[PDB]
Design an enzyme around this catalytic site. Structure first.
Site, mmCIF file in Angstrom:
data_model
loop_
_atom_site.group_PDB
_atom_site.id
_atom_site.type_symbol
_atom_site.label_atom_id
_atom_site.label_comp_id
_atom_site.label_asym_id
_atom_site.label_seq_id
_atom_site.Cartn_x
_atom_site.Cartn_y
_atom_site.Cartn_z
ATOM 1 N N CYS A 1 0.826 -1.202 0.000
ATOM 2 C CA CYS A 1 0.000 0.000 0.000
ATOM 3 C C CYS A 1 0.865 1.257 0.000
ATOM 4 C CB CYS A 1 -0.934 0.007 1.211
ATOM 5 S SG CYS A 1 -2.013 -1.438 1.325
ATOM 6 N N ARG A 32 3.704 -0.003 -4.884
ATOM 7 C CA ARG A 32 3.393 -0.607 -3.595
ATOM 8 C C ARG A 32 1.976 -1.163 -3.531
ATOM 9 N NH1 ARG A 32 7.550 -1.163 0.637
ATOM 10 N NH2 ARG A 32 9.315 -0.548 -0.694
ATOM 11 N N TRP A 95 -3.268 -2.218 -1.901
ATOM 12 C CA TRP A 95 -3.021 -3.597 -2.317
ATOM 13 C C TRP A 95 -4.051 -4.460 -1.598
ATOM 14 C CZ3 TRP A 95 2.010 -6.873 -1.086
ATOM 15 C CH2 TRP A 95 1.847 -8.148 -1.640
ATOM 16 N N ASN A 122 -2.167 2.260 6.246
ATOM 17 C CA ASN A 122 -1.298 1.208 5.725
ATOM 18 C C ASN A 122 -0.977 0.259 6.872
ATOM 19 O OD1 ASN A 122 -1.307 2.374 3.195
ATOM 20 N ND2 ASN A 122 0.728 3.302 3.396
ATOM 21 N N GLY A 123 -1.526 -0.948 6.818
ATOM 22 C CA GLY A 123 -1.297 -1.947 7.836
ATOM 23 C C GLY A 123 -2.579 -2.683 8.155
ATOM 24 N N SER A 394 16.664 -8.232 2.904
ATOM 25 C CA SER A 394 15.392 -7.587 2.592
ATOM 26 C C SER A 394 15.675 -6.310 1.815
ATOM 27 C CB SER A 394 14.608 -7.291 3.866
ATOM 28 O OG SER A 394 13.372 -6.665 3.574
ATOM 29 N N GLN A 395 15.307 -6.299 0.533
ATOM 30 C CA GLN A 395 15.426 -5.086 -0.269
ATOM 31 C C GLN A 395 14.680 -3.929 0.384
ATOM 32 O OE1 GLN A 395 14.688 -1.886 -2.599
ATOM 33 N NE2 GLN A 395 12.955 -3.282 -2.311
ATOM 34 N N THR A 399 9.628 -6.349 5.103
ATOM 35 C CA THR A 399 8.893 -7.597 4.941
ATOM 36 C C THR A 399 8.526 -8.167 6.305
ATOM 37 O OG1 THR A 399 10.071 -8.022 2.872
ATOM 38 C CG2 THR A 399 8.950 -9.883 3.907
ATOM 39 N N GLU A 527 15.343 -18.889 -8.875
ATOM 40 C CA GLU A 527 15.054 -17.480 -9.121
ATOM 41 C C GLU A 527 14.484 -17.267 -10.518
ATOM 42 O OE1 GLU A 527 14.653 -13.398 -9.005
ATOM 43 O OE2 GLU A 527 14.670 -14.975 -7.478
ATOM 44 N N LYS A 531 10.799 -15.690 -11.312
ATOM 45 C CA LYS A 531 10.584 -14.517 -12.154
ATOM 46 C C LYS A 531 9.594 -14.811 -13.271
ATOM 47 C CE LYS A 531 12.928 -11.287 -10.290
ATOM 48 N NZ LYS A 531 12.550 -11.937 -9.007
ATOM 49 N N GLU A 534 6.147 -14.829 -11.852
ATOM 50 C CA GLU A 534 5.621 -13.569 -11.334
ATOM 51 C C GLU A 534 5.096 -12.674 -12.452
ATOM 52 O OE1 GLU A 534 8.461 -11.424 -9.000
ATOM 53 O OE2 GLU A 534 6.925 -10.356 -7.849
ATOM 54 N N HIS A 550 15.084 -38.934 -9.325
ATOM 55 C CA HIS A 550 14.275 -39.381 -8.202
ATOM 56 C C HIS A 550 12.789 -39.081 -8.383
ATOM 57 C CE1 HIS A 550 17.957 -40.361 -6.117
ATOM 58 N NE2 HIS A 550 18.400 -39.127 -6.278
ATOM 59 N N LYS A 649 4.735 -4.931 -4.668
ATOM 60 C CA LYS A 649 6.099 -5.006 -4.165
ATOM 61 C C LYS A 649 6.117 -4.864 -2.649
ATOM 62 C CE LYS A 649 10.781 -3.495 -5.280
ATOM 63 N NZ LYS A 649 11.049 -4.746 -6.048
HETATM 64 O O1 LIG Z 1 8.623 -41.617 -5.550
HETATM 65 C C1 LIG Z 1 9.756 -41.261 -5.511
HETATM 66 C C2 LIG Z 1 10.808 -42.244 -4.982
HETATM 67 O O2 LIG Z 1 10.321 -42.853 -3.786
HETATM 68 C C3 LIG Z 1 12.159 -41.509 -4.824
HETATM 69 O O3 LIG Z 1 11.974 -40.152 -4.443
HETATM 70 C C4 LIG Z 1 13.089 -42.184 -3.813
HETATM 71 O O4 LIG Z 1 12.689 -41.774 -2.508
HETATM 72 C C5 LIG Z 1 14.561 -41.826 -4.021
HETATM 73 O O5 LIG Z 1 14.848 -41.795 -5.418
HETATM 74 C C6 LIG Z 1 15.518 -42.790 -3.357
HETATM 75 O O6 LIG Z 1 14.931 -43.279 -2.140
HETATM 76 P P1 LIG Z 1 15.739 -44.351 -1.291
HETATM 77 O O7 LIG Z 1 17.097 -43.727 -0.992
HETATM 78 O O8 LIG Z 1 14.947 -44.453 -0.002
HETATM 79 O O9 LIG Z 1 15.839 -45.654 -1.995
HETATM 80 O O1 LIG Z 2 10.561 -11.076 -7.630
HETATM 81 C C1 LIG Z 2 10.148 -11.379 -6.546
HETATM 82 C C2 LIG Z 2 10.178 -10.329 -5.428
HETATM 83 O O2 LIG Z 2 11.420 -9.626 -5.486
HETATM 84 C C3 LIG Z 2 9.908 -11.004 -4.060
HETATM 85 O O3 LIG Z 2 10.407 -12.336 -4.030
HETATM 86 C C4 LIG Z 2 10.503 -10.223 -2.885
HETATM 87 O O4 LIG Z 2 11.903 -10.472 -2.839
HETATM 88 C C5 LIG Z 2 9.884 -10.605 -1.540
HETATM 89 O O5 LIG Z 2 8.461 -10.601 -1.657
HETATM 90 C C6 LIG Z 2 10.286 -9.682 -0.409
HETATM 91 O O6 LIG Z 2 11.629 -9.206 -0.627
HETATM 92 P P1 LIG Z 2 12.309 -8.092 0.335
HETATM 93 O O7 LIG Z 2 12.370 -8.697 1.746
HETATM 94 O O8 LIG Z 2 13.746 -7.967 -0.198
HETATM 95 O O9 LIG Z 2 11.560 -6.804 0.298
#
Ligand SMILES: O=C[C@H](O)[C@@H](O)[C@H](O)[C@H](O)COP(=O)(O)O
Ligand SMILES: O=C[C@H](O)[C@@H](O)[C@H](O)[C@H](O)COP(=O)(O)O
Ligand SMILES: CC(=O)N[C@H]1[C@@H](OP(=O)(O)OP(=O)(O)OC[C@H]2O[C@@H](n3ccc(=O)[nH]c3=O)[C@H](O)[C@@H]2O)O[C@H](CO)[C@@H](O)[C@@H]1O
Ligand SMILES: CC(=O)N[C@H]1[C@@H](OP(=O)(O)OP(=O)(O)OC[C@H]2O[C@@H](n3ccc(=O)[nH]c3=O)[C@H](O)[C@@H]2O)O[C@H](CO)[C@@H](O)[C@@H]1O
Ligand SMILES: N[C@@H](CCC(=O)O)C(=O)O
Ligand SMILES: [Mg+2]
Ligand SMILES: [Mg+2]
Lengths: 654, 649
Positions: A1, A32, A95, A122-123, A394-395, A399, A527, A531, A534, A550, A649
């Site tokens: 806000c 904001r 917001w 704001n809050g 924190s930019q 936050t 990241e 992006k 977002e 896995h 933001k």
């Molecule tokens: O459904 C996904 C599988 O269960 C997988 O995530 C598994 O957990 C790992 O690839 C190895 O697991 P183990 O080290 O327990 O054999």
């Molecule tokens: O692109 C994503 C935004 O940048 C978002 O992830 C942001 O970083 C957080 O919502 C709070 O960030 P700050 O604590 O830095 O203000």
């Protein structure tokens, strides 16, 4: 806000000049919050301005500021030629995370059908339900579902039950805040107090910008308790600027007063006082909050990373003798080295900056490094100890979850360090020490330069921690040589903008995309996926390359877009295995790789070739292509990169 | 991929009975996946079984064991009624790595056109290039593109160049593995050593079952270096079952010997010995039954292992939780629990779903141990060279006990002097052996492609450990009681969740045509989101993603609109209000999510259209109940879309 109010005292402004300053103030605060907006001003069409302060007019509309600016104009009843020698206007972009962003839910909220009191907030008021039930029993009817309305209905209740006929506007607001709970930044306006504004805060930013051609009485307003006020000496002409962000005030003046919790500021007879301290000069320049020659703020902030990286290191890195000095840590660095664990706490992209520097921090400090999402950090009541060093990235420095984490760690006696981009923010104040990354104001909702500046800042800290180790001297030189070359290498990445736009035309129609990396580039795929979520609204997900085997690898086929990051570090061979697995599943991945990686470039159709750098810095170069990719994907899909949907933001509230 | 060999010594069997045993052995190994199979046995139709040991027959075929079994019973000039008092038959299922699936590349591989030596192999010989070159220079011609053939050719090279006329089969195999590099599990058969078998391993499981109506000479076979061996005392009758997986042995016997790297086990004159280059190998009893590896009345192993979770949770707790006086005792940790309680940090290391099991129990471990708890993905853990210290307790969660990255993390931590603990489901696996201590979760073998019961059994096992760590804290007595009472009621609450299968099927119909689904949760149910999204990825092949609810407003909330499917987990714990905010944030952006919530949550049910209502439990156990509906959702979606849930991808 966002909050903004313009108070001109004996500085004649026409009704058009005032409304433009209110909208122009919200446009500076639109990033904001842009789900709704509104303005508050005096109505009436009497040629004598004094006979118009008893009539308050509200213009609120759903949408962005450009929707409210159109509502302010082409109105048939408001004569925009009236001259006001004294006037107070308040505005507020919202917001709306809950309910509907309708004009009834936008601010300013009113106390009755005649607008005797209006407030912008704001809050959140954590006890507005009890305040609503109480006020309803006393004969006060409500019209909205916002917690802010209980503030307007309560300032009138204190006015309707005042002991004396001349209870100052400050007194009423004081009795209000004593009944409110939670956080709030308020700017009140009342017909009973013409031209008077009251500004208080408690856990929400709020500063007062003053401009006056005449000398000001003082530069350090004293606090009062239940030769005192700030005002022009010989004349009355003065202008005040209430704002929850310095971006809306820098264009008019760089002289602001950063209020504090429970500081009740009031402007009576054009004189500013603070009941219950300094008058600072801002170092921000107007050009820093302007798009310049770019069509959007995000693109500017992406392409200006060569300069912002340099600014983060300015006066802190010396490449002649390979020394690193963070002034904000000089009186704490020695004690930080006697601690036994590093905890990095942040949200979103600021958390990714910790993932991206976790490895080099473990390497150069030899300390355990734990990176935590602030929301989950709090849900679990994570164990924290006196010999922990806790970092808070924190930019905005406001936050909520990150700030609560800070106060959680402080209560347990940990040393708290801030990596922020806002000087007078809550996190930078309440931390014992920290580093201002000096990236400059970030206007785009999605953080771009803040991420890279946080990256560099955490690397500089790591270089200080190991500056007494003989065995690591060469490693420090290698890294510092990279930081010297990094701005030019970022430029080389930005020169591939067109090539990244072509690839965007191949993916903009897709529903999903998997971004795979490991090691130093785990954070990069997280990241990049964030992006793309977002600003493009594509279903992009970051997958740790070593985890493909896995389960997640089952998603890969000739139809599923895949982006892979394969750099020349110690994980190269493992990354080649992941690529081979993807190709075995018929995937046709786009690979972000090194220019000299001729093997990857030969056997892959689409590659983004970035220059080689130090392994613990390559993450800065490999994420920029994904910043640009997200930008071009949004344009192709017809979205506005500066104002994505469903959010704004800085998450300063729950 | 799958090894099985049957050696009947003075237990007369017909060729038909021998072949049926080999095929049945391979049927127990198909679940691991394979592209071909084959068997090796004594050919010839001499009524005297002794004149047939100089002729080895191979029947190998690209395809499934069913096809191989058809090939066996279609051979002419092969009489199945011949009775063998002594015989060695070997069988194999192959997962091709070197060479395309074909009969010549299938196992057993032979040493020459007369089958003087045949071998079955699981693994890869990394130096087969050099070996193939050397043998070719010595006059040995190859016919396959497999690394295995170099083993069969090499053992004959050692035989052709033996110094004495009576060099043992072991000696030859000893000289082979000295020249081999990589990982392997091997079983040899030769016409020159009729009825004899040799088995050896290096980084690949291999075990031997034994059966005999007569008393065995020992239950602990001593090792011999270059009373003494295992054998029936007063008579010769005995049967041996070489296998790479106990699943192929358990229907015949539960007395098995697990081999270790560089062991060379040999059966000579019906007597089993183990050679290397006092320590010995134990004949132990496996607590495993055939019914645990059979589908029964279920249509797939995934359905069985999901719906039998009430029983596996009970098996995990049996003998370890006393609901009479409310105490917890993990036998595998008796001689270490006090040293563990002096350490200063817990580190949980695993991959995939096992990692999610650590995420799911991190909070209660932090609560009850009051120590820092760090949950690490094994692959990333190794990439960063994570700092580990002598007073760290490092846990390694692995159903199979052989996951390379988890195993390498174990060896990394052991080097740093850390105390290592295993939470495994495979006896004598690498991770269970090499950890200082641990807990066998006793969930039973996991035959399905995806972890189901293993996840919930790891969950329960880690909770039990947490309850041991705080058994001396007066202030936590009530919390321990609450949790243990929840473990008491947990099997019945699981049955209650499974009775909602019909509601889960309706939800699968709604997502049948969907390409993405966001699963949102926080706190105790963060892991539930990650684990559910992984199963839906792995089983149904749609883009399911887990999102920490607290992170929505930091970016990911932009994906919400009236078209993106969303599943939200909202339980009655300390995060209830925070989860309600997340729901309001989604709904405000036109999202219409499905909610997994408490059975008694009246507010959520009336304001949401489709809700999966699970019974309420203690907060640190609700993750077991909230994840099962997602297990079933993955199952049903795959079935709806025509996929084979028991088929690996
Ligand atoms: O459904 C996904 C599988 O269960 C997988 O995530 C598994 O957990 C790992 O690839 C190895 O697991 P183990 O080290 O327990 O054999
Ligand atoms: O692109 C994503 C935004 O940048 C978002 O992830 C942001 O970083 C957080 O919502 C709070 O960030 P700050 O604590 O830095 O203000
Ligand atoms: C006044 C100021 O802002 N910085 C000064 C300092 O920069 P310098 O970089 O040395 O100091 P910083 O801007 O990083 O931080 C200023 C102070 O705020 C504290 N802090 C900062 C961030 C945070 O998150 N938590 C926290 O506690 C620091 O510990 C420090 O004591 O020398 C430079 C000289 O050209 C100039 O920039 C300024 O003279
Ligand atoms: C394998 C075995 O025979 N377990 C027996 C043991 O179970 P019990 O519950 O006592 O112990 P476990 O089966 O869990 O583990 C057996 C041994 O292996 C070690 N270990 C286990 C897993 C791991 O990952 N790492 C590790 O080192 C344990 O520390 C322990 O010394 O006593 C029970 C009777 O009371 C028997 O029913 C079980 O058959
Ligand atoms: N590497 C051998 C055996 C593979 C296996 O079955 O594990 C082959 O490809 O023939
Ligand atoms: Mg400070
Ligand atoms: Mg062990």
């Amino acid at each position: 806000c966002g909050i903004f109010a313009y108070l001109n005292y004996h500085v004649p402004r026409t009704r058009r000049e005032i409304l433009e300053t209110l909208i122009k103030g919200l446009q500076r605060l639109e990033y904001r919050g842009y789900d709704s907006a509104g303005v508050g001003f005096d109505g009436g069409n009497d040629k004598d301005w004094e006979a118009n302060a008893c009539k308050i007019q509200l213009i609120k509309k759903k949408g962005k500021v450009k929707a409210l600016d159109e509502e302010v104009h082409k109105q048939q009843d408001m004569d925009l030629d009236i001259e006001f020698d004294v006037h107070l206007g308040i505005a507020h972009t919202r917001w709306a995370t809950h309910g509907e962003p309708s004009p009834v839910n936008s601010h300013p909220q009113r106390s009755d059908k005649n607008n005797e009191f209006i407030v912008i907030h704001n809050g959140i008021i954590t006890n507005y339900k009890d305040l609503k039930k109480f006020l309803e029993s006393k004969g006060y009817d409500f019209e909205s579902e916002t917690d802010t309305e209980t503030i307007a209905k309560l300032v009138k209740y204190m006015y309707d039950n005042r002991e004396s006929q001349d209870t100052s506007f400050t007194t009423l607001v004081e009795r209000v805040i004593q009944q409110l709970e939670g956080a709030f930044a308020l700017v009140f306006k009342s017909v009973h107090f013409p031209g008077q504004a009251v500004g208080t805060r408690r856990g929400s930013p709020l500063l007062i910008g003053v401009r006056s051609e005449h000398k000001l009485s003082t530069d350090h307003i004293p606090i009062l308790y239940r030769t005192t006020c700030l005002f022009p000496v010989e004349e009355k002409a003065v202008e005040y600027y209430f704002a929850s962000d310095a971006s809306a005030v820098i264009e008019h003046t760089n002289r602001v007063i950063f209020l504090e919790d429970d500081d009740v500021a009031a402007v009576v007879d054009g004189r500013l006082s603070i009941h219950r301290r300094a008058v600072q000069t801002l170092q921000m320049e107007l050009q820093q909050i302007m798009k310049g020659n770019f069509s959007s703020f995000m693109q500017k902030e992406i392409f200006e990373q060569p300069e912002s990286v340099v600014n983060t290191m300015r006066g802190r890195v010396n490449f002649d003798d390979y020394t690193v000095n963070l002034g904000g840590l000089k009186d704490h660095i020695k004690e930080i080295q006697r601690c036994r664990r590093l905890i990095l706490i942040a949200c979103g992209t600021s958390y990714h900056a910790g993932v991206a520097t976790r490895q080099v921090l473990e390497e150069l400090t030899e300390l355990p490094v734990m990176v935590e999402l602030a929301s989950d950090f709090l849900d679990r009541n994570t164990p924290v100890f006196r010999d922990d060093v806790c970092f808070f990235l924190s930019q905005s420095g406001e936050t909520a979850d990150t700030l609560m984490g800070l106060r959680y760690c402080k209560e347990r006696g940990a040393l708290t360090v801030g990596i922020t981009n806002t000087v007078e923010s809550s996190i930078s104040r309440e931390t014992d020490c920290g580093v201002h990354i000096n990236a400059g104001p970030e206007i785009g909702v999605a953080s771009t330069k803040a991420y890279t500046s946080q990256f560099v800042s955490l690397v500089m800290f790591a270089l200080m921690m190991c500056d007494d180790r003989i065995s690591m001297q060469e490693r420090r030189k290698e890294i510092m040589l990279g930081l010297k070359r990094l701005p030019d290498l970022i430029k080389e990445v930005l020169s591939m903008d067109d090539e990244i736009q072509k690839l965007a035309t191949e993916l903009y129609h897709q529903k999903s995309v998997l971004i795979m990396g490991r090691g130093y580039h785990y954070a990069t795929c997280l990241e990049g996926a964030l992006k793309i979520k977002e600003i493009t609204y594509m279903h992009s997900e970051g997958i740790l390359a070593g985890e493909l085997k896995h389960g997640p690898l089952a998603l890969v086929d000739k139809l599923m877009p895949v982006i892979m990051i394969i750099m020349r570090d110690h994980t190269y061979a493992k990354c080649q295995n992941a690529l081979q697995q993807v190709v075995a599943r018929q995937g046709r991945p786009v690979v972000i790789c090194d220019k000299e990686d001729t093997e990857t470039i030969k056997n892959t159709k689409r590659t983004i070739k970035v220059p080689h750098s130090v392994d613990c810095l390559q993450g800065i170069l490999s994420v920029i292509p994904l910043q640009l990719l997200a930008f071009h994907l949004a344009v192709l899909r017809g979205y506005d990169v500066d104002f994505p949907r469903n959010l704004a933001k800085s998450v300063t509230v729950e």
